[PDB]
């Protein structure tokens, strides 16, 4: 489990709950493992991309001018060879992993700041959340604009595309979770989910059930077909900033403002 | 009402 904060990136062992490695980084805002679990890529608030190796225990690459503003989101393709980064400089850039350094590939200039970028598990769509309250869906292969999703009063903070690339869930600062049909872009259901900004929404792998965490310190487990809350999980004392789901769906990890990392196991 | 459809289909 990698946990990136302002000033350090610590990597944990989920079984022993002990930190194995610590790296010094910038104001990290988004982190993701690369396939194999041996590398981690950070997008800091200064516009830097930093790439670390666990075995070497050092910083392999830093790209100081990756973006002119904060890299708010960061996503990888399923193959792991392409990286998409959105920034507050209003651009989405594409990068390639070549033997291991990062090379800038293409740029796509948007109208407003970018808060989230998500690539579908099938690598067919790219969903980008913008500060003007809309989510834009593209075709990843050709980068052709496909849809724009409207209906959120306040900006969308998280996106997640289902395992079959049929539904897309979006969560905003206006406390709603909207479930859209990715065939036409129509909203199947709008849930008034939490009492505060909903920071993260994650599909459970190989299912349509999803999790959500909010600033109201509650993690909620939802049903994707019935649109009902299965379980409310009260453990954190303050805002829950981040959320993560295991590939097998066996457990979920949430980190909060109260410095606690809580692992929720499926029983 | 005069005439009609006489459906003999099985």
């Amino acid at each position: 489990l990698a946990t990136a904060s302002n000033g350090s990136l610590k990597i944990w062992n989920i079984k022993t709950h002990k930190c194995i490695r610590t790296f010094e980084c910038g104001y990290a805002l988004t982190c993701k493992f690369l396939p194999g679990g041996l590398l981690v890529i950070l997008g800091t608030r200064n516009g830097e991309l930093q790439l670390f190796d666990l075995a070497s225990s050092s910083l392999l690459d830093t790209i100081e001018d990756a973006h002119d503003a904060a890299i708010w989101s960061l996503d990888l393709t399923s193959d792991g060879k392409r990286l998409v980064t959105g920034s507050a400089d209003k651009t989405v850039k594409f990068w390639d992993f070549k033997v291991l350094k990062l090379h800038h590939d293409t740029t796509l200039e948007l109208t407003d700041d970018i808060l989230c970028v998500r690539v579908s598990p099938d690598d067919r769509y790219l969903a980008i959340s913008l500060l003007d309250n809309t989510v834009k869906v593209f075709f990843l292969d050709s980068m052709k604009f496909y849809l724009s999703l409207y209906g959120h009063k306040l900006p969308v903070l998280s996106i997640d595309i289902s395992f079959d690339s049929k539904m897309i869930i979006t969560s905003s600062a206006d406390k709603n979770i909207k479930i859209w049909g990715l065939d036409f872009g129509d909203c199947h259901k709008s849930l008034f989910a939490h009492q505060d900004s909903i920071m993260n929404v994650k599909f459970l792998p190989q299912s349509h059930n999803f999790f959500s965490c909010s600033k109201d310190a509650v993690v909620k487990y939802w049903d994707g077909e019935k649109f009902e809350c299965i379980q409310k999980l009260y453990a954190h004392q303050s805002e829950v900033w981040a959320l993560a789901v295991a590939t097998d769906g066996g457990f979920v990890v949430s980190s909060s403002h109260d410095h606690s990392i809580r692992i929720w196991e499926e029983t | 009402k005069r005439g009609g459809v006489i459906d003999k289909r099985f």
Binding site: L29, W72, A88, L115, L131, L154, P155, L157 | -
Partner: protein, 41 residues
């Protein structure tokens, strides 16, 4: 009946008062007033 007018103005929220100076104020009498970092952090 003027008091009945005043409370109706105060009760509603989408009301802006413009004074002689042209500055914008609420019915209460206090000056009526998103950022990516603020919402994300």
């Amino acid at each position: 009946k003027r008091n009945d007018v005043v409370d109706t103005l105060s009760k509603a929220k989408n009301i802006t008062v413009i004074n002689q100076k042209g500055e914008k104020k609420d019915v209460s009498g206090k000056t009526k007033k998103p950022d990516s970092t603020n919402i994300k952090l």
